[PDB]
Ligand binder design. Structure first.
Ligand SMILES: *[C@@H]1O[C@H](CO)[C@@H](O[C@@H]2O[C@H](CO)[C@@H](O[C@@H]3O[C@H](CO[C@H]4O[C@H](CO[C@H]5O[C@H](CO)[C@@H](O)[C@H](O)[C@@H]5O)[C@@H](O)[C@H](O[C@H]5O[C@H](CO)[C@@H](O)[C@H](O)[C@@H]5O)[C@@H]4O)[C@@H](O)[C@H](O[C@H]4O[C@H](CO)[C@@H](O)[C@H](O)[C@@H]4O[C@H]4O[C@H](CO)[C@@H](O)[C@H](O)[C@@H]4O[C@H]4O[C@H](CO)[C@@H](O)[C@H](O[C@H]5O[C@H](CO)[C@@H](O)[C@H](O)[C@H]5O)[C@@H]4O)[C@@H]3O)[C@H](O)[C@H]2NC(C)=O)[C@H](O)[C@H]1NC(C)=O
Ligand SMILES: *[C@@H]1O[C@H](CO)[C@@H](O[C@@H]2O[C@H](CO)[C@@H](O[C@@H]3O[C@H](CO[C@H]4O[C@H](CO)[C@@H](O)[C@H](O[C@H]5O[C@H](CO)[C@@H](O)[C@H](O)[C@@H]5O[C@H]5O[C@H](CO)[C@@H](O)[C@H](O)[C@@H]5O)[C@@H]4O)[C@@H](O)[C@H](O[C@H]4O[C@H](CO)[C@@H](O)[C@H](O)[C@@H]4O)[C@@H]3O)[C@H](O)[C@H]2NC(C)=O)[C@H](O)[C@H]1NC(C)=O
Ligand SMILES: *[C@@H]1O[C@H](CO)[C@@H](O[C@@H]2O[C@H](CO)[C@@H](O)[C@H](O)[C@H]2NC(C)=O)[C@H](O)[C@H]1NC(C)=O
Ligand SMILES: *[C@@H]1O[C@H](CO)[C@@H](O)[C@H](O)[C@H]1NC(C)=O
Ligand SMILES: *[C@@H]1O[C@H](CO)[C@@H](O)[C@H](O)[C@H]1NC(C)=O
Ligand SMILES: OC[C@H]1O[C@@H](O)[C@H](O)[C@@H](O)[C@H]1O
Length: 986
């Protein structure tokens, strides 16, 4: 660490500066590889920008970009270019976090499975690991360097590594040569923005002043409620972090207090609780208590992980999770922003970006009984000589769901005052926290104090507008220093409401009290207009910024206190623009509502919403009230059970006629896998042969020595995997899996054999992905997939040799579908043939009537253990130009039903792994763009019946959410290649 390398993004003790302007960085995490629809990135950025955020933080997943060692590819759906372009178009800056290690609940934690063949310890300066990362970092850091703000792009900060925070027993930590090598790779590729790290806790690793390996700005993370969503109402004792201001001053006082990841939801494992339950744990109450507690410590770089989670499509996730990565986030997996936590988070983002005094106020210790007579609340002050103070109030027991009545005694430029000055008590309801302010500037006006919280304010050309809110039935008070200027006659004017009271002191300080409710109060004091609303009303206000000009127009006039228009109403306001004498608004509506426009730019007289001009009513304050057309149609979707389903056997391996002469031989007598030394005479680890993704198969030939033989078989597929075994065409058994099992030891009898005859075992082993490697020195990502051990013995105990072949996805690291990437396909027959791709060769399938003996539908399934693949054309003709209509595939889970696993494919993209006996996921969203809403789609369902009685899908339906009338940019259909016969397939 030796200071800034450029003068665009700089920093000091208090904050980042961007173009010389101090700013609170309030960022949301988004992972581009979890939404492979380039035209929808702007949709996510619009929804994040509307929170009042200015930045997005993103990972890059190395395993998707260098599936074959030496061949970096980030094209098409893997290009970052549309992601950078969308950030520029939305006016969002970026924090780039490319790893190489990212964790992220992705397969391998970002490490490609070919790292299992690297002997040295991962995330150390073992040179085989270091050099294995060089090609990826040189490529990805050069792409991120071109997108730096110094070159007119959105990237302002770069994180090397990820939570490099501890190591296994006996491993050098911190390994400063290692850390510096990772920094040098990024510097050498042209990264000149500041480097920020993300220590897992305040451990000081990499902080400025620690010499070799130090970054520019020390950051750390926090997930104070953990990841088990079993008890969403339980906030345990000592869950609230209370030491971070002191920890910051102990570790890195010279740089801004930065929380590079702070909890925005939870991940959820197979057999977990579902993301609805995670969203109930990390809900709006969690945000108001925990996020304002971070403001109590003076956080000025603050990123919410996740803000939009997306989907672990195409096997990109790790075994510790399942297909969905909704994460319980503020923005759902299907991009809807209906959760209450979204609206609450908007209140907070909109408050910080008009409050520059928060940056320079000094956070002090938490107090009890100092700023209030009551001991039942804790108050943390942020103090300044003149530029305004902030007081974060919470229950003394942070978990409390009780209501507390209280008053405060706060320092102000007029002396210490017990507030309310006009009598009455303030209320703090259950799991709420508030920020009260003193000497808070509102343009040329000053709030001497306010108990009500600020949503926004702006100084328009002719009036200043301030929007204050409280929870319903809370009494609030604020005081405005003489707002009348010279004038002796000027008086307050009550514009709306009958609850607000007004008292003026001798020196013309105006003191207003009101009780928040559904009925807005509005008072005008000179050219200041204050709108006093309840929290639930404030949830529907929006503060789009007015564009500047040129390439960076979307970043507006400044990052703090930008020129804006205030809009009351709508499910989302995406943007405003001025076009001659017209204000043009892009908006989404999920329910009917009027739109009220507050702060009309000078000389504007026309209004348009989503490209349609409309009239409006004008209020006595000059606000516009408009009534755009909002038709929310009934949506009819095709019934899936009625499509024309085609079937193909996807376990032809077990038939007598099967030829496996094209399969790879599993003949490697040694392995470079140092984490799991071989127990078998040859390696049976998929990654040793280039297979890192999805289901594996093994074929073991032996000659029977005795009529009965005993097979011990140890398989490993990651958490919630399963494995099935046939002897020739005879089903032997399955390990049917459970959440807590990543491996299994199975013992089977192989009976009624003809001595001297050759037999072939077919062993199918699913993989739910590669493990993470979160503790440096413990090479956990190298846990192999396949067969860990076996023994075949004759009835007299003699050992019987087996010789082996194996496959994963066809071609392995020479994977066949460059467009959809290296992980999308596993090794099942129908995937190797490309039969999951659009327009499959129907002459290779069978069709027959449903509920008949020759049925070709997944609803009838199969009557024996095995694997079938089903495909059908699904035409859709939905009004996607005008409406955002989220679609999902729903499996019915039948309580008494034989176990099965299924794979869901949509236009060749795998968009679901369904595990009927483990769960929890039954509803699989797929985005518009992957689905074609005005065209033919191809759906695929693989059905793997685990038990001898077979299996079927009890029910499968397309589900739509309520249609949202939308002002988004149009979604382009992603053009995945259609089926083409594959040469050399097997
Ligand atoms: C369609 O509907 C179906 C219903 O009709 C539905 O099926 C049901 O699915 C459920 C969910 O999958 C099944 O429940 C689970 O069953 C699991 C398997 O239980 C069998 O095997 C176990 C273990 O056996 C091994 O270990 C033993 C040594 O102790 C040894 O004895 C064994 O030989 C073997 O080696 C047995 O223990 C079970 O026995 C008990 O129960 C049976 C009844 O079947 C009794 O007969 C016995 O007397 C005995 O009581 C059983 O044989 C089981 O593992 C699951 O346990 C978890 O859940 C319960 C809480 O509900 C909890 O008590 C238990 O401690 C386990 O808790 C973990 O998981 C929960 C949920 O996520 C967490 O909240 C909790 O904290 C624990 O989390 C930890 O462990 C997790 C792995 O278990 C791991 O994922 C997790 O990791 C991650 O999370 C944390 C955050 O939480 C992160 O911080 C961490 O980083 C991260 O890794 C964490 O480490 C559970 O009981 C149910 O059986 C099944 N029902 C039926 C009728 O079939 C189906 O799902 C549905 N389908 C769809 C699509 O929805
Ligand atoms: C169109 O899109 C819009 C968004 O623009 C969507 O609207 C959102 O819809 C969701 C889903 O319905 C709403 O979230 C759920 O809200 C309910 C209702 O509670 C809210 O509104 C009522 C007023 O109607 C408030 O009184 C509630 O606030 C009180 O209770 C909460 C605790 O729930 C507490 O935190 C507050 O401080 C407040 O307490 C005060 O009053 C109570 C009296 O009840 C009193 O006891 C206390 O002392 C205080 O005085 C609240 O704002 C809520 O029940 C649901 O929560 C439950 O489930 C979630 C999990 O899903 C858990 O996290 C939670 O803990 C509960 O168990 C949801 O929060 C959301 O508010 C709403 N947003 C907006 C802007 O309207 C539409 O749904 C979309 N429509 C369509 C068709 O698409
Ligand atoms: C802090 O307040 C919380 C929330 O009101 C208390 O939580 C309750 O704790 C008791 C005993 O553990 C449980 O029976 C309740 O069910 C809890 N309620 C909820 C909503 O979780 C908590 O005990 C208080 N803690 C301290 C240390 O005084
Ligand atoms: C082990 O590593 C070296 C690279 O050092 C490679 O040439 C060799 O093929 C690898 N062997 C196996 C069995 O993976
Ligand atoms: C399988 O058995 C071996 C001993 O052969 C043991 O080391 C291993 O832990 C067992 N694995 C599982 C998943 O039980
Ligand atoms: O969702 C849990 C998160 O935990 C953080 O500790 C980690 O840096 C992230 O990559 C992600 O794993």
């Amino acid at each position: 660490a030796k200071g800034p390398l450029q003068n665009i993004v700089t920093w000091d003790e208090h904050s980042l500066f961007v173009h010389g302007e101090r700013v609170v960085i309030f960022s949301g995490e988004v992972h581009p590889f979890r939404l492979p629809v380039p035209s929808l990135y702007l949709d996510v950025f619009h929804k994040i920008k509307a929170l009042g955020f200015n930045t997005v933080s993103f990972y890059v997943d190395w395993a998707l970009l260098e599936g074959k060692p030496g061949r970096f590819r980030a094209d098409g759906i893997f290009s970052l270019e549309p992601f950078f372009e969308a950030a520029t178009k939305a006016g969002i800056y970026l924090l780039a976090r490319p790893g190489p290690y990212i964790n992220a609940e992705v397969s391998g934690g970002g490490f490609p499975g070919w790292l299992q063949r690297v002997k040295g310890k991962l995330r150390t300066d073992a040179p085989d690991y270091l050099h294995a990362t060089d090609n990826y970092v040189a490529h990805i850091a050069s792409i991120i360097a071109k997108a730096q703000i110094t070159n007119g792009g959105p990237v302002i900060l770069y994180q090397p590594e990820n939570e490099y925070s501890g190591a296994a027993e006996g491993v050098l930590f911190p390994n400063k040569p290692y850390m510096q090598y990772v920094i040098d790779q990024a510097r050498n590729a042209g990264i000149i923005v500041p480097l920020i790290n993300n220590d897992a806790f305040p451990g000081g690793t990499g902080a400025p002043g620690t010499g070799l390996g130090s970054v520019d700005i020390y950051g750390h993370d926090g997930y104070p409620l953990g990841f088990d969503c079993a008890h969403p109402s339980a906030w345990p004792d000592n869950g609230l972090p209370t030491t971070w201001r002191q920890d910051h001053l102990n570790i890195s006082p010279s740089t801004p207090f930065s929380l590079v990841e702070f909890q925005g939801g939870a991940f959820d494992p197979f057999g977990g609780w579902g993301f609805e339950q995670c969203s109930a744990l990390v809900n709006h109450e969690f945000e108001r208590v925990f996020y304002k507690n971070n403001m109590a410590a003076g956080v000025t770089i603050f990123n919410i992980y996740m803000t939009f989670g997306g989907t672990n499509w195409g096997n990109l996730g790790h075994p510790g999770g399942y297909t969905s990565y909704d994460y319980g986030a503020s923005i759902r997996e299907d991009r809807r922003i209906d959760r209450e936590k979204y609206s609450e988070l908007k209140l907070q983002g909109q408050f910080l970006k008009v409050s520059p005094g928060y940056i320079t106020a000094t956070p002090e210790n938490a107090t009890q009984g100092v700023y209030s007579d009551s001991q039942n609340i804790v108050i943390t002050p942020l103090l300044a000589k003149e530029s305004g103070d902030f007081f974060v109030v919470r229950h003394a027991n942070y978990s409390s769901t009780d209501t507390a009545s209280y008053t405060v005694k706060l320092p102000t430029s007029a002396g210490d005052l017990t507030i309310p000055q006009l009598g009455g008590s303030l209320t703090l309801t259950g799991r709420d926290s508030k920020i009260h302010v003193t000497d808070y500037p509102v343009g040329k006006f000053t709030l001497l104090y306010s108990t009500a919280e600020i949503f926004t304010w702006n100084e328009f050309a002719e009036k200043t507008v301030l929007v204050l809110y409280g929870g319903a039935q809370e009494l609030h008070e604020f005081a405005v220093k003489n707002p009348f200027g010279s004038s002796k006659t000027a008086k307050a004017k009550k514009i709306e409401g009958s609850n607000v009271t007004i008292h003026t002191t001798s020196n013309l300080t105006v003191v207003l009290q009101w009780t928040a409710s559904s009925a807005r109060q509005v008072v005008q004091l000179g050219s200041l207009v204050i709108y006093m609303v309840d929290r639930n009303s404030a949830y529907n206000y929006w503060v789009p910024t007015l564009p500047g000009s040129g390439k960076q127009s979307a970043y507006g006039s400044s990052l703090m206190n930008p020129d804006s228009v205030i809009i009351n109403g709508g499910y989302l306001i995406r943007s405003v623009a001025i076009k001659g004498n017209a204000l043009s608004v892009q908006a989404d509506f999920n329910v009917t509502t009027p739109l009220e426009i507050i702060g009309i730019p000078k000389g504007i007289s026309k209004l348009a919403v989503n490209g349609k001009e409309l009239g409006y009513s004008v209020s006595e304050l000059g606000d516009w009230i408009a009534h755009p057309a909002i038709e929310i149609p009934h949506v009819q979707v095709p019934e899936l059970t009625k499509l024309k389903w085609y079937k193909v056997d996807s376990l032809p391996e077990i038939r007598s006629n099967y030829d496996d002469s094209r399969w790879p031989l599993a003949n490697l007598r040694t392995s470079n896998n140092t984490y799991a030394p071989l127990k078998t005479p040859v390696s049976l680890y998929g990654s040793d042969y280039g297979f890192h993704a999805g289901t594996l198969l093994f074929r073991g030939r032996f000659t029977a020595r005795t009529a009965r033989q005993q097979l011990f078989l140890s398989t490993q597929g990651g958490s919630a995997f399963a494995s099935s075994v046939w002897l020739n065409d005879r089903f032997i058994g399955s390990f049917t899996g459970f959440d807590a099992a990543s491996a299994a030891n199975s013992s089977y009898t192989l009976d009624r054999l003809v001595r001297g005859r050759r037999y072939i075992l077919t062993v199918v082993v699913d993989s739910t992905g590669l493990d993470e490697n979160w503790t440096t020195g413990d090479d956990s990502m190298k846990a192999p997939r396949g067969i860990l051990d076996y023994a075949l013995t004759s009835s007299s105990g003699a050992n019987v040799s087996i010789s082996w072949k194996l496959t994963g996805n066809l071609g392995g690291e020479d994977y066949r579908d460059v467009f959809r990437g290296p992980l999308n396909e596993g090794g099942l027959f129908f995937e190797r043939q490309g039969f999951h791709l659009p327009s499959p060769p129907l002459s290779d399938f069978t069709h027959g009537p449903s509920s008949s003996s020759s049925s070709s539908s997944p609803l009838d399934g199969i009557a024996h253990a095995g694997i079938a693949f089903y495909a059908a054309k699904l035409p859709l003709h939905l009004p996607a130009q005008e409406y955002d209509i989220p679609l999902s595939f729903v499996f019915d889970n039948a309580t008494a039903a034989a176990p099965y696993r299924a794979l869901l494919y949509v236009n060749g993209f795998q968009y679901g792994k369904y595990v009927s006996n483990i769960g929890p996921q039954t509803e699989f969203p797929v985005p518009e763009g992957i689905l074609d809403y005005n065209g033919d789609n191809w759906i695929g369902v693989a059905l793997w019946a685990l038990e001898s009685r077979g299996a079927k899908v009890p029910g499968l339906a397309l589900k739509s959410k309520s249609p949202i009338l939308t002002g988004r940019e149009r979604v382009e259909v992603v053009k995945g290649p259609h089926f083409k016969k594959r040469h050399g397939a097997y």
